[PDB]
């Protein structure tokens, strides 16, 4: 009981500390900036060949190559300038839910309902593509995975834990615990020393990589958090939950800044992403269509319509020239 | 065509990749896929071992020129909502329930079987997916009703304490839970122990599902 009382005292300390710094909000100060006006986008390419639903994609760092995964039991590597297929890789278990692309261009990774993260090597002297590693040790499905470099990887699972793996050895190095529910996403920083993750207990946590302890907790959503992304500066991030809202949280000010919602929208969000200057926030939806928001005004409905099922994944290149979306109707499209 | 020679070699390679993908997709649609469900120790292991025997578990078998893949999922310790929509295109759901556990309150087991059956049937992802229902352990139930009738958990039951009356009452109790009687059916069986009847019943129910789907596709 004494520990509970002191915990309540500390919670009230955090609450009042957050309250003390609310000198002004974001909405009252940016109302003097010119808006984006109206933004119109057109489909430049259409990539065909996946048969079943599409669950994730990831851009390469040269802004020309792309990887995608479906429930067919196939990974595909595309050239997005000529819509050519560079590679097609068959999986061992077809219940895949995530994929990642190495920042050097030598490796890819994928995971699913079999609790194991597999890692593939693209550049051999035999011409084919081989499995270089299998990382096992979780007790629930895998939700995300993001390379740090050619030898260190991060994973999040649906048994309330995250892990940092050293690929060459094959064994975990550090483990992150503290969520009371399934972890659904993660997003690295530009300097790759911190990351964030959101869980099905409607909370997000900020983790430090080298030591291994939680640093910050962000609350406020009503239901689970389904997609997370990290602002290009490195000082803020934006979440999307299953109550038809997105929100912006600042790491330093340690409270919320702004909410993106509209009264005609009654479905959840499955993906968020940013633009290079930080003046557009793109969000996929269950309403079958993506949607573009002005990040500094929290108002627009500039839909990129054209899909016939729910939008499962989207992404923006490393220079800013294109936007790719993929959805449950098996077609992936490039907009410019 | 202003492509150089290397671009033409790239185009040839891409077309070959397309051909391979299409052929594999053709082959992946001539199969039957069943999702297996049960309850706590609902004797689901027996069903698995009888017919042709971390994370998902898959069983594969071949019968009368059909290829069945059965997915068992008991090792996932998370909620069903984060997990079920992946199985939206499945052909049928094979459900196991145990009869002898009518007097085993853990509030007995029949109530849990009813609750989970009602949760599965009325799901929005399974608006046209049919169910194959297995009732297990008829023997031990038959001896146990020699001493304790069904009134111990069904006070409103108004029949004699014999075998077939109780069996039919339980079967109708479980099949009345349907709320989509016009779209999907429910098949029932009393688990044999001596021969391949447990497999022939699945074969027949799947053939019926296939025929009805073919007719309903043509709008006929």
């Amino acid at each position: 009981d004494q520990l509970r009382q002191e915990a309540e005292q500390l919670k009230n300390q955090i609450r009042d500390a957050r309250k003390a710094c609310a000198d002004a909000t974001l909405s009252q100060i940016t109302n003097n900036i010119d808006p984006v006006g109206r933004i119109q986008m057109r489909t430049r390419r259409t990539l065909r060949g996946h048969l079943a639903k599409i669950y994730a994609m990831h851009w390469g760092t040269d802004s020309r190559l792309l990887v995608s995964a479906s429930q067919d039991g196939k990974l595909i590597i595309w050239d997005s300038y000529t819509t050519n297929k560079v590679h097609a890789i068959p999986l061992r278990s077809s219940w895949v839910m995530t994929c990642a692309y190495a920042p050097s261009g030598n490796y890819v990774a994928c995971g699913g309902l079999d609790n194991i993260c597999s890692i593939y090597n693209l550049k051999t002297r035999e011409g084919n593509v081989r499995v270089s590693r299998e990382l096992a040790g979780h007790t629930g499905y895998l939700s995300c995975c993001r390379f740090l470099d050619d030898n260190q990887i991060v994973t999040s699972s649906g048994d309330t834990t995250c892990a940092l793996w050293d690929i060459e050895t094959g064994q975990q190095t550090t483990t992150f615990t503290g969520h009371t529910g399934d972890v659904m996403s993660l997003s690295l920083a530009p300097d790759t020393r911190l990351f964030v993750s959101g869980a099905c207990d409607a909370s997000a946590k900020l983790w430090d990589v080298r030591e291994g302890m939680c640093r910050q907790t962000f609350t406020g959503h009503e239901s689970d958090i389904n997609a997370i992304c990290f602002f290009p500066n490195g000082n803020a991030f934006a979440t999307g939950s299953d109550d038809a809202t997105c929100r912006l949280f600042d790491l330093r000010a340690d409270q919320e800044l702004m909410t993106y919602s509209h009264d005609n929208i009654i479905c959840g969000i499955t993906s968020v992403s940013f633009s290079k200057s930080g003046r557009l926030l793109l969000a996929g939806y269950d309403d079958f269509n993506c949607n573009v928001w002005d990040a500094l005004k929290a108002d627009r409905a500039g839909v990129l319509a054209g899909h016939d099922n729910r939008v499962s994944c989207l992404g923006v290149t490393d220079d800013g020239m294109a936007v790719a979306t993929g959805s449950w109707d098996s077609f992936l499209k490039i907009w410019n | 065509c202003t492509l150089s020679a290397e671009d033409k070699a790239a185009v040839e390679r891409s077309k070959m990749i397309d051909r391979n993908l299409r052929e594999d997709g053709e082959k992946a649609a001539r199969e039957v896929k069943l999702l297996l469900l049960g309850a706590g120790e609902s004797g689901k292991n027996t069903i698995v071992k009888q017919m042709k025997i971390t994370g998902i578990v898959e069983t594969h078998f071949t019968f009368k020129d059909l290829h069945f893949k059965m997915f068992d999922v008991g090792a996932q310790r998370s909620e069903r909502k984060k997990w079920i929509h992946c199985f939206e295109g499945v052909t049928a759901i094979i459900f196991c329930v145990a009869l002898s556990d009518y007097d085993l309150v853990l509030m007995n087991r029949m109530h849990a079987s009813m609750k989970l059956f009602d949760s599965i049937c009325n799901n929005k992802w399974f608006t046209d997916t049919s169910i194959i229902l297995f009732l297990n352990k008829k023997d031990l139930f038959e001896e146990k009703i020699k001493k304790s009738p069904l009134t111990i958990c069904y006070p409103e039951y108004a029949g004699s304490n014999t075998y077939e009356e109780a069996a039919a009452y339980i079967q109708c109790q479980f099949e009345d839970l349907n709320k989509r009687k016009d779209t999907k059916e429910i098949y029932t069986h009393f688990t044999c122990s001596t021969d391949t009847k447990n497999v022939q019943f699945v074969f027949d129910a799947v053939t019926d599902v296939i025929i009805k789907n073919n007719l309903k596709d043509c709008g006929l």
Partner: single-chain antibody
Amino acid sequence: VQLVESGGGLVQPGGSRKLSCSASGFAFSSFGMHWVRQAPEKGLEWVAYISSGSGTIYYADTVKGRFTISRDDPKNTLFLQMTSLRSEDTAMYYCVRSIYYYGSSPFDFWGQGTTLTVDIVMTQATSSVPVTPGESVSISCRSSKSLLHSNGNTYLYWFLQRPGQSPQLLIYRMSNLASGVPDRFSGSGSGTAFTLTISRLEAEDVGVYYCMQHLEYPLTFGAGTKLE
């Protein structure tokens, strides 16, 4: 990785011949294959090309209608068939490997050759260059047409051949450097005129250098520059 070919020898006027090449240690069914030729006293000369899937065949204009190329995938073996051989056919024959997708390195593994005994132009400005170890050198060759395509490429290749050995890729597409090659070589230039450069010469870097184009078929070689 290994390619071993055989079938060479001595032949009379007329007649016919068949040379075969066995691949081992790689996915021979995903690679396009070339046959290349070298005279006993001259430079190299391209001969024939068959692609992955056997849907494309190219010949040289001095051999078309007399030569035939074929592959056999389940056994991983490549064949050339020559008909009615004359005096000009005497040479060494090399089997070469190449794979084309976005960002690959063609012409990187060569066979070892066999002895058989019976258009854009590139010009090598020299024939022999005497130098001493520790110095840097530069080799140059010239073209007759611009090699810079509209998509941004530049189909220029630099190859090396040491005494008594098969050649070896050094530089593909005029600026890129192959894997397994010490990073003291370089190459540059601009349309129709190109120059390779070597820094800090050492032993076992003595022999003949070649510059090649691949902008269109046929493919054409140079005279060869001899460094000693």
